[PDB]
């Protein structure tokens, strides 16, 4: 739903998403020891963790933070 | 087969780095055109810092090949802190050499005796202390995997206090030196040393610039291609090996010492 989409310096954006992709997923893909990219978005239930990467799945509103 | 290729490439990089830096240290501590002058101690220490930076490369290599951390949380913290410390120490060492040159070029008006070893060793100790205290406090303030518990503030602080600020300081220092020289035939030892150092600064900047630039970009919020970013991350470790080549190409007596 209306969860965090862009989280970085210069503001944190919380937005909604169209119906059918209500739940919020927060996927952590680790590039090097000192860089762990986070992708926060919407999904129907939750997407799949390819390459064995941690992905938290949330059904409530504003859970990814 | 990819894992073996990467392991072999990183091992050759480590071997070349260690060999070049050991040769540089020996050359600085031997002969007469290198041991007698005192400014070569800064070069020897930069070589030593690059040399000890080969306990960081193998662990990043192991992380890449295995795909997960295999050393524990405490060693993960130590590895992060020391990995930041080594690059920060190298760049601040370049800054310290530039600042010493700027101070010397503006002090000869008031005369100076031969107390240079004390000043050189004082700068040696001071730059290591500054590199430690400009990198550790930000780190301590902020299935196994070695992570950075970041709020997107450590990236900006690390890049500012490791790359951008010393770069601006050195730009200002060398602009001042150029202006002073402009206000005030054969080449001298000091001219050769300054040229070699300037080439080293250029190599360091062109090597470490892409990684810190895209690191700042990731802090700002722009995504980065993963393979390109990893290549940029390893290209600084490549710089570590490249530096002794810069010493041995553009300064002849270093080459003679290496041959001996």
Curated annotation (Swiss-Prot), chain A:
Tissue: Expressed by the venom gland.
UniProt main location, coarse: secreted
Protein name, entry field: Muscarinic toxin 3
Cysteines joined through disulfide linkages: 3-24, 17-42, 46-57, 58-63
Main function: Potent antagonist (IC(50)=1-10 nM) of M4 (CHRM4) muscarinic receptors, and CHRM1, ADRA1A, ADRA2A and ADRA2C adrenergic receptors. Also antagonises ADRA1B and ADRA1D adrenergic receptors with a 10-times lower affinity.
SUPFAM superfamilies registered for this protein in UniProt: Snake toxin-like
Gene3D superfamilies per the UniProt record, alphabetical: CD59
Lineage: Eukaryota, Metazoa, Chordata, Craniata, Vertebrata
Organism: Dendroaspis angusticeps (Eastern green mamba)
Pfam families to which the protein is assigned, alphabetical: Toxin_cobra-type
UniProtKB/Swiss-Prot annotation, chain B:
Coiled-coil region: none
Cytoplasmic compartment segments: 30-40, 100-121
Nucleotide-binding is among the record's keywords: no
Keyword Transmembrane helix: yes
Site entry: Implicated in ligand binding: 83
Transmembrane segments: 4-29, 41-66, 77-99, 122-142, 153-175, 196-216, 231-250
MF terms in GO: alpha-1B adrenergic receptor binding; alpha-2C adrenergic receptor binding; alpha2-adrenergic receptor activity; epinephrine binding; guanyl-nucleotide exchange factor activity; heterotrimeric G-protein binding; norepinephrine binding; protein heterodimerization activity
InterPro entries: ADR_fam (IPR002233), ADRA2A_rcpt (IPR001946), GPCR_Rhodpsn (IPR000276), GPCR_Rhodpsn_7TM (IPR017452)
Pfam families registered for this protein in UniProt: 7tm_1
Keywords, comma-separated and alphabetical: Cell membrane, Disulfide bond, G-protein coupled receptor, Glycoprotein, Lipoprotein, Membrane, Methylation, Palmitate, Phosphoprotein, Receptor, Transducer, Transmembrane, Transmembrane helix
Membrane topology designation: Multi-pass membrane protein
Assigned GO CC terms: axon terminus; basolateral plasma membrane; cytoplasm; dopaminergic synapse; GABA-ergic synapse; glutamatergic synapse; neuronal cell body; plasma membrane
Site keyed Implicated in catechol agonist binding and receptor activation: positions: 158, 162
Effect of mutating residue 158 to A: Lower affinity for agonists. No change in guanine nucleotide-sensitive agonist binding
Family label: Belongs to the G-protein coupled receptor 1 family. Adrenergic receptor subfamily. ADRA2A sub-subfamily.
PANTHER family xref list: ADRENERGIC RECEPTOR-RELATED G-PROTEIN COUPLED RECEPTOR, ALPHA-2A ADRENERGIC RECEPTOR
Name of the protein described by the UniProt record: Alpha-2A adrenergic receptor
Source organism: Homo sapiens
